[model samples]
Target chain A: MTIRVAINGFGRIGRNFLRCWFGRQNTDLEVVAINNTSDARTAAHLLEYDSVLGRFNADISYDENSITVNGKTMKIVCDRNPLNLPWKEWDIDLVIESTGVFVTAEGASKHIQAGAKKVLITAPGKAEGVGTYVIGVNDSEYRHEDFAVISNASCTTNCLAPVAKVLHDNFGIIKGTMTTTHSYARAAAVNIVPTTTGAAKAVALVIPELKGKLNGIALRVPTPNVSVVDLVVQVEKPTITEQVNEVLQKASQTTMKGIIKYSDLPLVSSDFRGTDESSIVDSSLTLVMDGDLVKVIAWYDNEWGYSQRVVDLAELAARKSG
Target chain B: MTIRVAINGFGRIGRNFLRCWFGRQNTDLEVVAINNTSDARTAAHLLEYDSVLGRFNADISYDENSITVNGKTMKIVCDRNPLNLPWKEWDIDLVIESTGVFVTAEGASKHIQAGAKKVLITAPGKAEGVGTYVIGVNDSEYRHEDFAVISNASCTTNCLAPVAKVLHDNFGIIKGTMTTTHSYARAAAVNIVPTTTGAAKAVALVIPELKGKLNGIALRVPTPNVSVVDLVVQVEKPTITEQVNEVLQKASQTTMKGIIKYSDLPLVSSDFRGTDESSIVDSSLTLVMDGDLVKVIAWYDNEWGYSQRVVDLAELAARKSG
Candidate 1:
């Protein structure tokens, strides 16, 4: 049976999700519907011609009324409120919420109330009780029935979570320091603005037991696309971090054999510009032991690269049970 | 009568000396002889442009025999070897050696042996026997006729010497760790090339009796001009380094008010491209005291800014005693 999906919010992530699924080999996966507050035709064009991959003559068409891709059609229904979407009648199995707003279970439950099987939140929700799922890190622990609403944390969280998990599992982390030298995003282009990042804060939710165990810092440098994270980690004693890191890199390679990738190639910001692949291991600055402090640096095209992972993980969860 | 000076090596320092002297109100100085290894025409042109307050006119010609600046003519001689310059015949009271070579008392005495009365080495010489002279730090202890060959020390020495002096005076430094994130020079170009700097070795000479008292490490970054020395200093007692560094900056200002400049300006390598001043304190990354360890970052133009001071000190010694 085909796993029908719906994307709510047509921002960078939401737009890129369509791009990732449109080109993938998963015959069972299909983009059944899309809901946005903005111009639907514009959103449809973003999927059709307005891509770095450029203007694929896929059977995708858009008008003021409805949009169609690969012979499957969905109406671009506008609603000031998210509850207006008819997910129940459409039999939309999974809803990917990419809107920066509506970060509560009550707000996300509107899709379930409208008759969706599950709601996958691409951003962190504010409500005190919400099931947070970090792909590849804690995805296995996600409860199917209990987690009706699964929060797929932000890009920074997606990048750092795997790194922290890999380090902790192999080496047993004592304490660590992380500095994310992030590039600009759509959130920054609007104005000289300071908005909230649910990434770092949502990390506590990922590993609730080790709430006070980890310490990290984030710096938004004046750049455009690629972001790098410098992780200065102190590993548990008796465990040589070099040995542990070697295994971690091997695991990262194995885990991302086909889906994700590990590269030692030195890359700049423009290297991964508008690339819709999630979590690229920038191995150039992946230092294991810097005189007892292991420093690791990784790069990700925050918008395109990481957002694609959100779609892949959502599909992976829908297949399992969450 | 004015003190006649001979300047050897027409690199960054040699040119800036002429600029500083020409701008200064002091009239007791005369650049009588200039010697370069190759490209005599370029050396003569540089001197003409840098000569005090446009004293050098266009009509003033340079021949194989002589150089005329501002109608005040001086002999132009290109010596392939250091010991070949006719300093005595020109009545050169002192010789300022700006060449990267011949950094030893035995090496410097070659100028006096050839003909000059006094020789001041612009770069750090092997002064294991003779002490180093930092202007504000320990200039008072210098004897007028003490050791004919004087070494001005390297630029890194100039920066960290004052820092060490102050820390020693105020809190008594047991031992310290220093790293100079220095800008590139003629030696290090467009790369983080590791050149041999005797900063750790030469610093002992600057602080007399404090030989083997402190330890340091320096790394050259890929900056064009300005250098920033990040010094990690450890004191005897658990004292805050901010208070200690404040004392150093304050002492530098009050002690050598005109000579030493305290600046809070955000400086990059390009900002100090042509700046040929002796001492500029980058107030931004001055000193951060964490327990007993003090971290200090200092910015300086390696060639133009620092080498100028070396030339001035050489001239000052000549006028006083030569």
Candidate 2:
């Protein structure tokens, strides 16, 4: 059941995905090879000391061609093109396309050409043949064959999609409008930069019922790690703020347990750093306006949080590729 | 037309009120005296430096019984009882009751006994003869004669009343619930403390139409000064986020102009220190659910912001008392 995984890029998301996988227990996936522009020593040093994630816990060593963390050896290769990757020779079962450059169906298809059985792009892919996926939202909706060329979507989308899923599932959504207070292309920290994110387009891709029914904007601030998604939606059922919070709390405890977390404490954004959940619903800030309009505010870490989801999607893709 | 004013306590609220009134331009209210439990030296020192409101800007000096601020000399009297103050001798027109002790009608009536024409309690009063008032909400409704022994209500009320007034005036609220991130009985800086506030009762007193239709809770966090009121209401009108934000922006510009300011920027809590507006509508965090349910987050400085409202109330009471 051990699926040999190859990370196509070893930057923030790829490195984070590696650390996340290393920390996880009872997983069916193994990082056998990592293809990056940087060499093995640089990758090992960067992974061993991260500014955001802090110090790595394991003893890491590197040579000219490979890096080892806690006795687990991983091959490090240099390649700018996905087609030139040694995915076939290494017998890579899955390729995590986190290189940020190859995000299209045509570009990512090169990993498959290099003999990888499946490829998962950490960035949003060109929507022609590649299917976009958010783990807790619509992951089970798609079949195993469609997992060949899959897109992991944007970090903002990963933070928002699951919360939107729960809201739309328990209480049918009539319309949705969202806002994310996030980092804008590294939006100048000195100012509040208004930016655009096609969050609705991705949600509509999975939840077809919400197609043409949802739209929103993103505001980028000076914050470094954590971001928040402030979502408001019109619903079919009539409910109170407490009732809505109860529903989310139940989901956080049961169905959406790991993917979504319910937080009632009055916490700041920095408190959510390194949390694994895709969405951390601050139920203290949750509200329902006019019996049917509900507003839910959730906190997320862009780097580590999304990397957790990438691991989940990779695992799901691993188990389902029968 | 100059109305002689006296402050009954030299604590946070009273000092903030004095500093607020001192900075205003073209004001008819003049401070002639102050009554506190501490000595004049301690009073002057405390006024020069504050914890929540920050350092005072003026050159302050004091002798045995008198303090001077920017050349304006005022006698500092020590008394716990309202009738014991030297208000009669100073010919005071209005007394700002920030002592936190005398809140009931009978207790505050001693100010009238001491010869001040009116007593404005800075805290919520017992429902005997004292009437609660929030400036921009129902300040214009009460007759000048009924101005005796008025209650300034809670700080949260001052922040909520104007916003609630605008929503009820423009959209017609059906029901409401609110949450305030605030300080609890000095809620510790080490933890998130859950507390209760009668914000709805205060609103009901001012906006009678929303009586029994509104209620909420308060969460006291480790924050030092600024607080936010996250309010959700069911309105009769069906509107989107842009429309809702536009309505608030118009109110911030026109009618509730000075009291409610609208913000489209993404800002943290500390950015709102010493703001004069009773409520700063963070239109960025605002959202509408189910077409009629609307959620709005407004930042307020619990100390300086509330103190600003106190100055306004004192000025209104001074002007209206014919």
Candidate 3:
């Protein structure tokens, strides 16, 4: 049976999640509704043409009450309250929370109380009691009975955890530091601004051993999409650049699967514009120092890559319910 | 007598150095000629209009062998070899070697051999025996009697050293890692590419103590001019964010002076387009992890800010020779 989905907050991640779902052409999941603060006309235009991702391919139409794409009409709920939406009435089995506004577990659970079976926050959850999910890292641990409210984690965290996992598993991390040279968000488009990131917190949630060992900083640069995570880890054992490359390469080919990709070729931000992987490790940029200190650069399409994982989690949640 | 100067390789740094010199309206130094690989017509047009910096304000006219800006006629020599220029004939006391091609002490000294009294390579010298100078950090170490050829450290290194120096001195650095999210160069204007940077080498030159302790990677992003250096240091003493802030604040006001600036105000890459400081530490983004590992983000006008330092050094070299 196809799972019915509802998306809240049609912003960067929200709209992109919809685009990714559509791009996958998967028949197992269907978007039934979108609850946004924006009006139908504005939402329709934004969904049609994104400055970063370019034009949407499907025929999209909008009425005062709903937006229709490719003959599937979805209600456009404008309620600001988290519990005010009629997810039960629309039969939405899952809610993809991308508004970035209601990120607390308490806030996300309001959807479950209002009749959706599950709620997945697009950003990291600030309040306790939510399960943080990074697809290849901890999504397998997700138990339907245990987690009704989930967090997909932030884009930076999505890229950091898998790489952190691989390294921590192989050599054991003594301490780690990360700086995300991220693309400008809508608010930071024209400026270089300091942003607080939940990368460390999210990684801790995925890899319990690294609870207090990781800290990170985020610098919003003037680019449209791709983000780079410059991670430096002090491993317990001395490792060579080739060994680190082998670990990442094996991860990309096995458990990481489609989630992590490898690129030895020279690349820049524009090179990963619409790329779907959570992270692409630059083998040439990796350096091992003093036998234990390691540096690795990983690139991600913050909007598209993270959105694809959100969709994957949504599908996973739907399958569990079935 | 006014010190006559000739600039070799009228690329980004060379042209911006001229712009900074002209903008200063300093009467002590004069540009006698510019040697470039491009013809006078192409050189004049490029000098007149830049895609990144915009149009040159001064009236510019070109002849077969020269281009005149603001009524000061300077010969444009399209010589590929630095040894071919007749600097002595023009009474040129100094040559700003910005070609980025002739970056060794031996290559730069050829300018002096060809007739200039002193030669300053605009990029970090890959070869030994050249004096490396970062305006506020080690420019004081420059002794006229001891050095004929000098290197102005790369733009990233120019930003990295002063901050690294302060932190290393105040708290004692155990190790450090840096990644420069740099503006797209001429070769990377349309693509995201991996680039070899002079940052670590530059830092080694300025601060002798940091010679083998630091390593870095550079990602050529698709922005025009401003670059961000994401630096993380493992200090000997455990520190806090406030302490790091105080150090940078004091450095900005005192030793750093015009070379380094600090800002807590919200900013972006565009804000630093024509900023004069070699580096501006983002106070808001500074993070001290586990009391010791420090993350600092510094912004710089890779073109204009660095070019100003090149000009300052050029004037210093000229003053010393006199």
* Maximum-DockQ candidate: 3
Model 2, span B1-322: residue lDDT tens: 6789889989888888888988888577889889988899999999989876678889799989899999999988888878777788899988888878888898888999999888889888976798788877888776768758898798898899889988888899887777666643331443344466888678999999998777676655444667777677778988887988888899999888888989887665667777889899888777676577677778777878777778887777766768
Q: Tell me the TM-score for chain B of model 3.
A: 0.92
Most TM-score-accurate candidate: 3
Report the C-alpha displacement of residue A17, candidate 3, in angstroms.
4.1
Alpha-carbon runs more than 4 Å astray in model 1: A1-3, A27-29, A48-60, A83-93, A104-118, A124-127, A146-149, A185-202, A208-210, A222-224, A238-245, A255-261, A265-291, B1-322
State residue B16's C-alpha deviation in candidate 3, in Å.
3.2
Cα lDDT listed for each candidate: 0.63, 0.81, 0.84
What digit string (tens of lDDT, one per residue) describes model 1 on residues A1-322?
5677888988777877777776777745667778887776787777767534457567877778778887778777777566777888888888888887777888888888888888888877678556887777677676677677778777787777776766666666555545454645333322111123445456667766446445444434334556655454555644443555565568666764332345555444555565554555555444343233354555567766666677667767657753
Native contacts matched by each model: 0.00, 0.07, 0.39
> What local lDDT does model 1 show for residue B93?
76
- Real interface contacts reproduced by model 1, as a fraction: 0.00
Native-referenced Cα lDDT, model 1: 0.63
lDDT of 1 by residue, B188-258 (tens): 33222223456755666667645765544344443345565545444566665456556756875686554
Model 3's CAPRI class is acceptable
Query: What TM-score does prediction 1 earn?
Result: 0.59
Report the C-alpha lDDT of model 3 over B1-322, residue by residue, as the tens digit: 5688899988888888888888785756889899988888888898889887899989888999988888898988877887888887888887888888887788888888788888888887866878888888888887877777888888888899989988888998777888887865434544455688769767878899988888888777666667888888889988889989999999899988888889988666777788899899989888887787788899988778888889998877766764
Which regions of candidate 3 fall more than 4 Å away from where they truly are?
Answer: A1-4, A9-84, A185-190, B9-11, B22-31, B36-84, B185-191
Global Cα RMSD, each model: 8.3, 5.1, 4.1
